Amino acid sequence: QQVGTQTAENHPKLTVSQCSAGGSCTTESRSVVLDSNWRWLHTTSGTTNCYTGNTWDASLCPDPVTCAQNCALDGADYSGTYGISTSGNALTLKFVTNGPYSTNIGSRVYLMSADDTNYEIFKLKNQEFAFDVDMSNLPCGLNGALYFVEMDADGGLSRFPNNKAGSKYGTGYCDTQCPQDIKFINGEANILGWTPSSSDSNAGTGQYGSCCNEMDVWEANINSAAVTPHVCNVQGQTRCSGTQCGDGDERYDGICDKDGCDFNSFRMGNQTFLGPGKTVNTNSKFTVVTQFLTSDNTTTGTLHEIRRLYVQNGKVIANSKTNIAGMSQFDSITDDFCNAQKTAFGDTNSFENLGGLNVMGQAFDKGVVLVMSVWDDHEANMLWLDSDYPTTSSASTPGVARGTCATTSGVPANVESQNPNSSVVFSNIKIGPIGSTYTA
Ligand SMILES: *[C@@H]1O[C@H](CO)[C@@H](O[C@@H]2O[C@H](CO)[C@@H](O)[C@H](O)[C@H]2NC(C)=O)[C@H](O)[C@H]1NC(C)=O
Ligand SMILES: O[C@@H]1[C@@H](O)[C@@H](O)OC[C@H]1O
Ligand SMILES: [Mg+2]
Known part of the structure; x- marks a missing residue:
């Protein structure tokens, strides 16, 4: 994709903290950028759209390369059109925003580095990462996600x-779902076999995914939360086609x-731990701390364990x-945990088949980008x-119940219709050695 200049691109600012043993942190000036899929995409010479609703303009985009050469991503009206705003160390993502020219449902942003051009690269091995979240305004069917890819x-x-x-325009997304709804992958428009979504009027899928x-x-939402490493047998952002993408039956x-x-504490058999008025009380803001422990307690050792702590009201x-x-019985993610849980639940252990925490840690060695999103x-x-999931499984079967929401909940049109003003606030991001990002 090309660069459009109709609208200047100004990334909302966000401060993060880099912390040291003892708990003193320095404030770093960073910023966030909107993912390219959300942007106005128009001809390089003018204002004609290359994509409208969920349909590509066939005469501007006759093939993937012509389309990428003809079509430009433009700057974004972060708050008024996309519901994205920051206030110091706090990022607020609104679920539904009505801009003057377009309505946007959900958002996805990446953290920029000090240069405000390239993404920030995090090296998480043997580090602790903390943030605060207020998800009191995120009901059933919503996900406010903070994650690395x-x-x-x-x-x-x-x-x-x-x-x-x-990266200035939020290109290059990938994750372990190998999403095929991404409009530009590997610098080419993903228009081959393009199929509109029937339920999402703004989306479609093409032949390729990005993994x-x-x-x-x-x-998480106010009801339940999950922390989940996912691995691949490829290193870095990789375009997939066919069986590689693991779509549908080829999951x-x-x-x-x-x-x-x-x-997910609930799925793992503790239904009183996290939620409204529970041990971690999601009616109010709290701190989520995540520790990425190596086998030898160095930054170069093998990732062995992911531990979780919460901090609320000091x-x-x-963790449950x-x-x-x-x-x-476990209280953290280890390879032993994964083996035990996949066996207990009768779920295919692809995590371990694809190299488990070792492979996750190798992605961390090379570096990962911080993503924050809100979506249905x-x-x-x-x-x-x-x-309860699958909805066709007995809710007494271990692994099926993941929260208290009804099996009829979360239909996008219903959630948009019923809770449009939902939002999540992510704030006070900190990274440092183990123990450094919060006060015990
Ligand atoms: C779920 O985890 C919570 C937090 O660890 C456990 O909370 C305890 O619950 C009992 C029963 O109400 C209380 O008497 C204790 O004071 C609680 N401890 C804490 C630290 O909050 C709870 O037992 C766990 N539930 C299950 C089924 O294992
Ligand atoms: O990441 C999620 C995965 O863990 C799975 O359970 O299916 C839904 C996905 O979005
Ligand atoms: Mg290039």
Whole structure:
């Protein structure tokens, strides 16, 4: 894709903290950028759209390359059109925004580096990452997600000749779902076999997907939360086609682990731990701390364990323990946990098949980009996060119940119609050595 200049691109500012042993942190000036899929895409010479609704203009986009050369991504009206605003260390993502020219549902942003051009690259091995979240305004069916993916720092500017926009315009997304709804992959418009979504009037899928390792630090709404590493057998952002993408029936045949090795306290058998008025009380803001422990306690050692702590009202709260009959008891993510939980639940262990925490840690070695988003789910209505899933399974079967929401909840049109003003606030991001990002 090309660069459009009708609208200047000014990334909303966001401060983050870099912390040291003892807990003193320095403030770093960073910013966020809107993902390219949300942007106005118009001809380089004018204002004619290359894509409208969920339909590409066939005469501007006769083929993937011509389309990438003819079509330009333009600057974004972050707050008034996309519902994205920041206030110091706080990022607010609104669910539904009505701009003067377009309505936008959900958003996805990446953290920029100090240069405000390339993404910030995080090296998470043997580090602790903390943030605060207020998801009191995120009901059933919503997901406010904070996570890392193995994107290129420049979003593909240097790898792909026909990507002339790059990370400044939020290009280069990938994750372990190998999404095929991404409009530009590898600097080419993803127009081959383009099929509009029937339920999402702004979306479609093309022949290719964009795949990479993904650490889901946080996927949650007021009801339930999950922390989930996912790995692939490829390194970095990789375009997939056919079986590689692991779409539909080929879910477990692809290059990436779609299910991941998840820890949702509710799913793991503690229904009183996280939620409205619970131990972690999601009616109010709290701190989420995530530790990426290596086997030798160095930044070069093998990733061995992902641990979780919460902090609310100044009190540290230990992670819940698993409570699945017949399964050994864990309170964190280890490869042993993943093996035990996949066995207990009868789920295919692609996480381990594709190299487990070792491979996750190798993605961390190379570096990953911070993503924050708010979304509803056209495929599964977020039931995998907050309800009984599959809905066709007995809710007494271990692993099926993930939260208290109704199996009829989370239909996008219903959630948009009923809770349009939903929002999530992510704030006070900190990274440092273990123990450095919060006060015990
Ligand atoms: C779920 O996790 C919570 C937090 O660890 C456990 O909370 C305890 O609950 C009992 C029963 O109400 C209380 O008497 C304790 O004071 C709680 N401890 C804390 C630290 O909050 C709870 O037991 C866990 N549930 C299950 C089924 O394992
Ligand atoms: O990331 C999620 C994955 O863990 C799975 O359970 O299906 C839904 C996905 O969005
Ligand atoms: Mg290029």
